[PDB]
Every structure is written in C-alpha cells, then in structure tokens.
Amino acid sequence: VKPNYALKFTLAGHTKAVSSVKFSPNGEWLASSSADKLIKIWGAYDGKFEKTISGHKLGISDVAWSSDSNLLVSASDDKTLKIWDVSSGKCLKTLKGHSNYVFCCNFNPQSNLIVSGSFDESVRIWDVKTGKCLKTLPAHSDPVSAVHFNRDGSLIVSSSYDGLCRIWDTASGQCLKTLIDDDNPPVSFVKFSPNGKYILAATLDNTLKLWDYSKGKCLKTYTGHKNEKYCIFANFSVTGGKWIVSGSEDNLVYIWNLQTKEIVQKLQGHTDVVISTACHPTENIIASAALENDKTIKLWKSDC
C-alpha cells in the first residue's frame, strides 16, 4: 500500500520564507510562521486565509498550538517567545530570558508548560499562566534545533548541532539519556512518536533515524532526501498508513513507509526548500511550506 497525496490548495500571503506550519489539535486550523515576523491562520480544509497575528520585532522560526487549540506560542529571532490568544490575536505573554535567537518551541499535553530551544545552547521550561521561566537546562554545547514533550509531558527530548539528542525529566530537570551515534553529525530535528516509545531524529547528513528510547538503539533509517543545511521538520503520519513525512532541500516532500523504510511518495510542486511539513490529526492531509523563492504553503490530500 502506498499513499496518493495530491495537491489541493496553495496558500500565499507571507512576504518572506515560511519557517513552520502546524495544524491545530482540533483539526480546524493551520498556523504558519515566517521570516516576515508574522503568524498567519488558515482554514485546514479549504486553505481559506483567516487572520494575521503580529508583534514580534524579528523573524519567527517556530510556532506551536496548545492542546485546546486556543493558544499559540511562537519562537523568534528577537530572543523572546510570545503566547497568543488565537481568537483575539492578542499577545498574552512575552517570555524573556534566552540570550540568543529562540529557534523551537512546544506546549506540553496539559498545556500548562512551554519548552523552548535557543541558539544560546539552553533549553527553557516556562509557565504558561505567568509567563515566568520555571527551569533552564544547560542542555547542549551548540544551538538547540528542536524540543518536544512526550505524550504525558513527563519527558522532553532536545536535539542540537553538537550531535546529541538528550531526554530530560521535565519535573526534575535531570538528563535521563543521551543518544550518541558514531561520527556525531549535527542533529537538526527530533520528536517523540505518538506512543512515546520512539524518537525520530534528523541529522545534517541527509538521514532520518527512528530510535527506541528505552533501549538507546537505532531501529530504522530513512534516506533518499537532501538535508544538509536546514532544520527540516519531520512527522509521523498515522491517520491512514503509517508513514514518515519530511521536507527536503531538493524542493520535494518525501513520504516513507515507516516499517520498510521505502520511499512511497515524493510530492513535487514547491520551488524552494521544503522547510516544514505537518500532518492533519484526523484526515490524510499534509501541509508543506518552503523558503524564499517560494513562500507558499501547500495542502495535499490522500485516500490512505
């Protein structure tokens, strides 16, 4: 079985490279952040432009939804994170304390905490209600490329250009495990599988790997794409067939069979690097987004 994703919509409106796209957990909306300092909200099913959210002084590298779909957090080159009320577009809180560009961010499942990663090589945990920093983890010795909570928020996984993935106990701040692999290629993205048992990690040697967290073992490798320069988001697609989805520096979206590691589709249509992909939580829908020469988001639909 292979998917048959086909282009349904192209979404335009950002005036610089798009950095990140995410579907709201309730399936209604797509949020996009951009080097143009703006967040935009789009209808998930029709691509209809809904609204622009502004306030960052410099470009945004990541955006993420709270679990009730009511809040967003954005990570900006202005060295802050901002928490936004989606329906009003208002900035509720500005999270200050990183001493360099903020690159990546995520809510925990309860959405009372935000985790962030920065070029200052640290990971920070923030209280959503007050906006205060709760913990700083001296997590890495290079920029932190990705941070992600597991399914019940008890663990954080962080990745870095230093070649490490590290799993942290959220509450105690203690590093429980470090994944190290051979020649230490920079790690550009990382995230837990939906069941919390595996970690998908992208490295800047054109490689994606699926690790068993408990055993510290690489179980699967996925190749064929180009990824040497950018921190490209990758996903587990679970609504239909079990795929791995990623962008690529050859302007294609790659879809792999998770178990066999075979490439099952390449989505063509972007005209610059596909920096970001997202999978819809209930439909077989992929959103993809691309850099300066393109600046658009594409929505793709499959029957499986």
Partner: peptide
C-alpha cells in the same frame, strides 16, 4: 529574517 529560514 528567521534563523530557521537561513542555511547553517
């Protein structure tokens, strides 16, 4: 300008 959208 965003660090994610610039090459490493």
């Amino acid at each position: 300008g965003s660090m994610r959208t610039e090459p490493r």
